[PDB]
């Protein structure tokens, strides 16, 4: 009824410990969601074309051209680690767990409140808020996954991360097909390159409507909506990282000399002349058996063209890479292609007392050593005469195509049947949790945005919309906008996310890396004297595991 509650607030985390070292992590998240009525009740096909920014030669990477359908519906997205776990929960998980499974997900909407706003004619403005007990909130769950998948973590538009702060749903939109061409250039290119928006291919048009595709529930103040429990079918996610590159695979060489006194410069020596050694190499025209030249089982990682931009029907885009840079852990300034950079607002980690439109940003440097250090690569002639001469070697300091700033490693790909690589680590709190698999016939081996990828399906998207609240002057044949009472809704959202994790075992004599509080990061986890909060980022794959 009007005065009866339809649900309970729960933002607790439960750790039920099953048999055989497994734990059943249940994460409950409850939010107060504020929803305003849409700016228009209509679907808009809008086209963006920043020809002013791209008309500057050399700015082709700043292209924003696209077409999208703008919908009156809003999306309630909880696909971010911060919606479920606070820093203590994350510390427990990443310090005590070895692997993580995604089990089930359910959500519900309860305690719906719809209000109206009326402004007086008094010369000094004043306005009052009234309940509309008969107003309804439209709710649609796309359980069949008919609508385009639009995960909000990409735009930092999921639900907030604080149980005690109200949150909002992101207005919903999806990409409408367009054709675009942009010929790249540089500062000093003669003429204006081709920079044209071509229009839309009729064979690719897809105008989706929530009304025509999803059942819609009308909720009054006494109604509730529950989705039911969806069960995932994803692969396990590892909370451990690999440090072994190809140089650390297999039996090391026997040291026929070992140091007799401890010290930095007291090295051990193999003691066998290099071309007189025993072992296996994949180089049939040399007798040198060295650490660089000895055969290894396979490859760990792969070189890829970095900051390579590829063009298709819709315009340029960056070629994605599955691993981060080498040497970035030692020097953060060297973090580059492959190290994901997140920008976010005050709902999602930025100090809440800060003023200004500038977001908080961090580049996520992962602990796994699967990257490449391109400054250390080189090609050389098949003859393999050592020491190598200038004409028989290609170094990263060597111009490709006549350019002093482009070398061979920029256009270099070594992905092959021998490549081994890991899935992307989880990123707390701004990282996406699960992603839908592409509907291509042949599927990618991994996703760069989520550690969990859904094979068959995973949960439909939850859309909300304040139902139209018309005045007495409505005329559907009028060309002007709809006359509506200023109406908005506040409703409570509760979700349950279930994980299954495996407790870790100490395999080594030494202790491992763990997340801890210290004097430096002490005040990143508590409120300020004026109530400000922040959620800094945390690394996930702390513990090391042996690759081979």
């Amino acid at each position: 009824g009007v005065g009866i509650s339809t649900g309970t607030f729960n933002n607790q985390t439960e750790f039920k410990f099953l048999e055989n070292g497994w734990v059943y992590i249940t994460a409950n998240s409850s939010r107060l969601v504020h929803l305003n009525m849409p700016e228009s009740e209509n679907y808009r096909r809008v086209v963006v074309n920043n020809l002013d920014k791209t008309a500057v030669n050399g700015n082709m990477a700043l292209d924003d051209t696209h077409a999208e359908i703008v919908t009156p519906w809003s999306l309630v997205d909880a696909n971010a680690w911060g919606v479920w776990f606070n820093p203590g929960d994350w510390q427990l998980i990443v310090n005590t767990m070895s692997e993580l499974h995604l089990v089930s997900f359910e959500q519900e909407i309860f305690n719906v409140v719809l209000k109206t706003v009326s402004e007086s004619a008094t010369q000094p403005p004043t306005k009052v808020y009234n309940n509309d007990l008969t107003a309804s909130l439209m709710v649609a769950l796309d359980s069949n996954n008919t609508m385009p998948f639009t995960p909000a973590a990409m735009r930092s538009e999921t639900l907030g991360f604080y149980p005690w702060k109200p949150t909002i749903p992101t207005p919903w939109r999806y990409y409408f097909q367009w054709d675009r061409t942009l010929i790249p250039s540089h500062t000093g290119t003669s003429g204006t390159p081709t920079n044209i928006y071509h229009g839309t291919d009729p064979d690719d048009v897809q105008f989706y409507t929530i009304e025509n595709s999803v059942p819609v529930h009308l909720l009054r103040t006494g109604d509730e909506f529950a989705t039911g429990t969806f069960f995932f079918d994803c692969k396990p996610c590892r909370l451990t990282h690999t440090w072994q590159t190809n140089r650390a695979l297999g039996l090391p060489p026997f040291l026929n000399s070992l140091p007799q006194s401890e010290g930095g410069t007291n090295f051990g020596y193999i003691g066998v002349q290099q071309d007189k050694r025993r072992g296996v190499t994949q180089m049939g025209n040399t007798n040198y058996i060295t650490e660089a030249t000895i055969m290894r089982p396979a490859e760990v990682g792969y070189s890829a063209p970095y900051y390579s931009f590829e063009a298709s029907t819709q315009g340029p885009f960056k070629t994605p890479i599955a691993a981060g840079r080498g040497g970035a852990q030692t020097d953060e300034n060297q973090a580059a292609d492959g190290d994901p950079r997140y920008a976010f607002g005050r709902q999602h980690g930025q100090k809440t007392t800060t003023t200004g439109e500038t977001p908080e940003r961090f580049t996520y440097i992962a602990h796994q050593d699967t990257g490449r250090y391109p400054e250390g690569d080189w090609i050389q002639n098949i003859n393999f005469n050592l020491p190598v001469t200038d004409d028989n070697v290609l170094l990263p300091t060597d111009p490709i195509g006549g350019k002093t700033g482009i070398n061979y490693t920029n256009i270099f790909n070594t992905y092959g049947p021998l490549t081994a690589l890991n899935n992307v680590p989880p990123v707390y709190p701004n990282g996406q949790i699960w992603d839908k698999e592409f509907d291509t016939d042949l599927k990618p081996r991994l996703h760069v945005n989520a550690p969990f990828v859904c094979q068959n399906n995973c949960p439909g998207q939850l859309f909300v919309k304040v139902a139209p609240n018309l005045t007495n002057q409505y005329d559907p044949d009028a060309s002007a906008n709809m006359s509506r009472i200023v109406t908005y809704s506040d409703f409570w959202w509760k979700g349950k996310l279930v994980f299954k994790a495996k407790l870790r075992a100490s395999h080594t004599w030494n202790p491992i890396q763990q997340m801890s509080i210290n004097v430096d990061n002490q005040f990143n986890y508590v409120p300020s004297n004026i109530g400000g909060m922040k959620i800094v980022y945390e690394k996930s794959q702390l513990a090391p595991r042996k690759l081979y």
Partner: antibody, heavy 126, light 109 residues
Framework: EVQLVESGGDLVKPAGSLRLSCVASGFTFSSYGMNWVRQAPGKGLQWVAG???????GYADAVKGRFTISRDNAKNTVYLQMNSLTAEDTAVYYC????????????????????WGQGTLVTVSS | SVLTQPTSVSGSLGQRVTISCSGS????????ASWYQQLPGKAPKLLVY???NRPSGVPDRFSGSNSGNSATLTITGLQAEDEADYYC???????????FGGGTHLTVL
């Protein structure tokens, strides 16, 4: 090779109306826009109007309130309708094709005529 | 919006010729000019695109460039084939109006 042929020239009174037509061939007609550019005797070229695949049109400020242009992709034909003609409209009108593929509402951001017809004469006088 | 061209330009056989077209940030500063050739009484012919490319069969003699709000057409190795009239064409994206220049007559000496 691309080829265009125009028609419809005539002499009309200083306040009459007239209609012109071009026929095209040799390319994907629906993918490229078609334009009407005129040249007064002894003067330079002047743009009149253009129409794209979906029927969207653009008119110069000199003819925006008077003229009308249309297509028929099933017939590879483009028409121009002129109303309330004045003496200044006297010129030879040339029918041309765009180099760039544009179809819908958001054209006229990049235009470059790559093939041309033969032209037809329009004379406005008593 | 209208483009500006010099009335005439003169060059001698074997020399270099330059024709200049001036516009604004609204027309040429975003979409560069495209150059056309018109023999007396004949239909125009495109010579250089806005990006410096030429239609198939156009000699490399013809070239173009864009700087700020002005564009130029350069004819190298002027031959007797080049005695004609030339026009600069640009489109205004703000208004959606195609703009031609006033035209320039080329004299070969």
């Amino acid at each position: 090779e691309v080829q265009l042929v125009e028609s419809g020239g005539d002499l009309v009174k200083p306040a009459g109306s007239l209609r012109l037509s071009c026929v095209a061939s040799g390319f994907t007609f629906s993918s490229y826009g078609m334009n009407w550019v005129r040249q007064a005797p002894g003067k330079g070229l002047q743009w009149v109007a253009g129409v794209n695949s979906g029927g969207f049109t653009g008119y110069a400020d000199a003819v925006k309130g008077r003229f009308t242009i249309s297509r028929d992709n099933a017939k590879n034909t483009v028409y121009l309708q002129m109303n309330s003609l004045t003496a200044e409209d006297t010129a030879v009108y040339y029918c041309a094709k765009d180099r760039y593929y544009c179809t819908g509402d958001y054209c006229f951001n990049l235009i470059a005529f790559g093939y041309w017809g033969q032209g037809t004469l329009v004379t406005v006088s008593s | 919006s209208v483009l500006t061209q010099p009335t005439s330009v003169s060059g001698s056989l074997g020399q270099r010729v330059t024709i200049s077209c001036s516009g604004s940030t609204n027309n040429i500063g975003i979409v560069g000019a495209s150059w056309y050739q018109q023999l007396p009484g004949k239909a125009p012919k495109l010579l250089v695109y806005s990006d410096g490319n030429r239609p198939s069969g156009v000699p490399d003699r013809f070239s173009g460039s864009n700087s700020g709000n002005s564009a130029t057409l350069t004819i190298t190795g002027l031959q007797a084939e080049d005695e004609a009239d030339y026009y600069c064409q640009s489109v205004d994206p703000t208004l959606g109006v195609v703009v031609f220049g006033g035209g320039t007559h080329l004299t070969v000496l």
